[PDB]
Design an enzyme around this catalytic site. Structure first.
Site, PDB file in Angstrom:
ATOM      1  CG  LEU B  22       2.430   2.334  -5.928  1.00  0.00           C
ATOM      2  CD1 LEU B  22       2.593   3.605  -6.734  1.00  0.00           C
ATOM      3  CD2 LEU B  22       3.786   1.769  -5.581  1.00  0.00           C
ATOM      4  N   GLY B  23      -0.685   1.593  -2.454  1.00  0.00           N
ATOM      5  CA  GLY B  23      -1.534   2.058  -1.371  1.00  0.00           C
ATOM      6  C   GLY B  23      -2.770   2.779  -1.894  1.00  0.00           C
ATOM      7  CG  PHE B  27     -11.787   8.785  -4.230  1.00  0.00           C
ATOM      8  CD1 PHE B  27     -10.499   9.181  -4.610  1.00  0.00           C
ATOM      9  CD2 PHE B  27     -12.832   9.670  -4.466  1.00  0.00           C
ATOM     10  CE1 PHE B  27     -10.267  10.420  -5.196  1.00  0.00           C
ATOM     11  CE2 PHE B  27     -12.595  10.906  -5.059  1.00  0.00           C
ATOM     12  CZ  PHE B  27     -11.315  11.279  -5.423  1.00  0.00           C
ATOM     13  CG  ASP B 139      -5.127  18.796   1.599  1.00  0.00           C
ATOM     14  OD1 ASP B 139      -4.872  19.035   2.803  1.00  0.00           O
ATOM     15  OD2 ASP B 139      -5.566  17.693   1.178  1.00  0.00           O
TER      16      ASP B 139
END
Ligand SMILES: CC[C@@H]1C(=O)N(C)c2cnc(Nc3ccc(C(=O)NC4CCN(C)CC4)cc3OC)nc2N1C1CCCC1
Lengths: 132, 289
Positions: B22-23, B27, B139
């Site tokens: 998926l990517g 990390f 975030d």
């Protein structure tokens, strides 16, 4: 600039003549943007029938999949562009192509209420029980 | 070095076949994984223990897991478990098959107001749940607001999240750099729940305007604009929305709406919210009413 980028923009905007010019100048008909949309995707989703045909005649990949798993046929079906659906099938679009939800163009057409599309997809071999 | 083809949870006995890549997610390498028995498909986050240097990356890993696993809400990514081998940490999350608002944004740029309203309401409801459970996300951004098959927003990526442990606690530290830096994070004053309201403000601006509110080509100029509250809402933005943006994007964190006050803004209680977005809305603008 990049002819590919120019061809993406022209296919989106429905600029028939620009698309032909760019193709004659060697633009990659299989150029992709930052979410995997090809000129064929963009033309298909925007209802630009002439451009869809031009791209296909020049060998545009009919089953290119974007970042959602949409083929041009998915996009045409979901927007109700019957003639574009027909021509994509004529160039051998996978009528049972799965997006990343395991949905085919038929699922999407049905969900959006594009019933004429549903009937055409069925005519060209759409499987109602297609499953990923 | 090599990721197992089959992931086995020692505890629950569940075994997961590693599927399509998926990517990267920081990390982590992420994959579609499927339970061998039930055949359910999940998003697997696979973090090499080699990359979990004890500092900001490691205890960050533990914090994400600690916070996320304690959460369960309609607008929060489902947490389905975690386990480890000698080489890897494995996190099993809800697979969100319609990507994120980032992908939407790249294709659509500015949304129609009803779309923004539809998405923003879910973002706010999700964030209200976090705040009520004493979690600040810290975030929030387009890339961690995932969409399921029903185009329901799921808040994900709790890697910067923190738990407010006592009342009036001022957080001073983040284990990374947020996408949208709140003015109070740029300052020495510390920060709290209002940082999420700031980011929702930035998100709302981006969804309606089609570009970020502060970001320029130079980080220095960007940071300076943030601290001076210099931005402009284009005149074609409707007054109620503009006003709500202005309420969120204020330097003084105490001046911003609480998440509940945000949820209860005129922007949400009036104005149209579609019963459904057509799947075309991932690629082209939809017509309404
Ligand atoms: C698990 C990490 C994080 C998360 O937290 N959740 C909840 C998540 C839930 N769902 C997804 N969904 C999908 C994510 C990517 C893809 C996909 O197709 N990606 C690429 C396409 C381009 N290609 C060259 C490489 C593969 C499909 C997804 O759903 C079908 N991703 C999630 N991510 C993302 C995982 C990579 C970044 C972050």
């Amino acid at each position: 600039s990049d002819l590919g980028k120019k061809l993406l923009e022209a296919a989106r905007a429905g600029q028939d003549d620009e698309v032909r010019i760019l193709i004659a100048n060697g633009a990659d008909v299989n150029a992709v943007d930052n979410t995997g949309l090809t000129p064929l995707h963009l033309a298909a989703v925007s209802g630009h029938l002439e451009i869809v045909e031009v791209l296909l005649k020049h060998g545009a990949d009919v089953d290119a999949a974007d970042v959602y798993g949409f083929t041009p046929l998915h996009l045409a079906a979901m927007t109700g562009h019957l003639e574009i659906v027909e021509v994509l099938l004529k160039y051998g679009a996978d009528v049972n192509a799965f997006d990343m939800t395991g949905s085919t163009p038929l699922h999407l057409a049905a969900d959006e209420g594009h019933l004429e599309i549903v009937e055409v997809l069925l005519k060209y071999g759409a499987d109602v029980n297609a499953q990923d | 070095k090599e990721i197992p083809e089959v992931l086995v949870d020692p505890r629950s006995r569940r075994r997961y076949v590693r599927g399509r890549f998926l990517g990267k997610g920081g990390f982590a390498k992420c994959f579609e994984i499927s339970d061998a028995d039930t055949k359910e498909v999940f998003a697997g986050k696979i973090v090499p223990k080699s990359l979990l240097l004890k500092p900001h990356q490691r205890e960050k890993m533990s914090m994400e897991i600690s916070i996320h696993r304690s959460l369960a809400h309609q607008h929060v990514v489902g947490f389905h478990g975690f386990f480890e081998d000698n080489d890897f940490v494995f996190v099993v999350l809800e697979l969100c098959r319609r990507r994120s608002l980032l992908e939407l944004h790249k294709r659509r740029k500015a949304l129609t107001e009803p779309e923004a309203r539809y998405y923003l309401r879910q973002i706010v409801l999700g964030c209200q749940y976090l705040h009520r459970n004493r979690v600040i996300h810290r975030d929030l951004k387009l890339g961690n607001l995932f969409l399921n098959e029903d185009l329901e927003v799921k808040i994900g990526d709790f890697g910067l999240a923190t738990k407010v442990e006592y009342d009036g606690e001022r957080k001073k530290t983040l284990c990374g750099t947020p996408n949208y830096i709140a003015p109070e994070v740029l300052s020495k004053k510390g920060h709290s729940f209002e940082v999420d309201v700031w980011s929702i403000g930035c998100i709302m601006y981006t969804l309606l305007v089609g570009k970020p509110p502060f970001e320029t080509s130079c980080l220095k100029e960007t940071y300076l604009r943030i601290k001076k509250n210099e931005y402009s809402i284009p005149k074609h933005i409707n007054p109620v929305a503009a006003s709500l943006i202005q309420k969120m994007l204020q330097t003084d964190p105490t001046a911003r709406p609480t998440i509940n006050e945000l949820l209860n803004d005129e922007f949400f209680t009036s104005g149209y919210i579609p019963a459904r977005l057509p799947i075309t809305c991932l690629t082209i603008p939809p017509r309404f009413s």
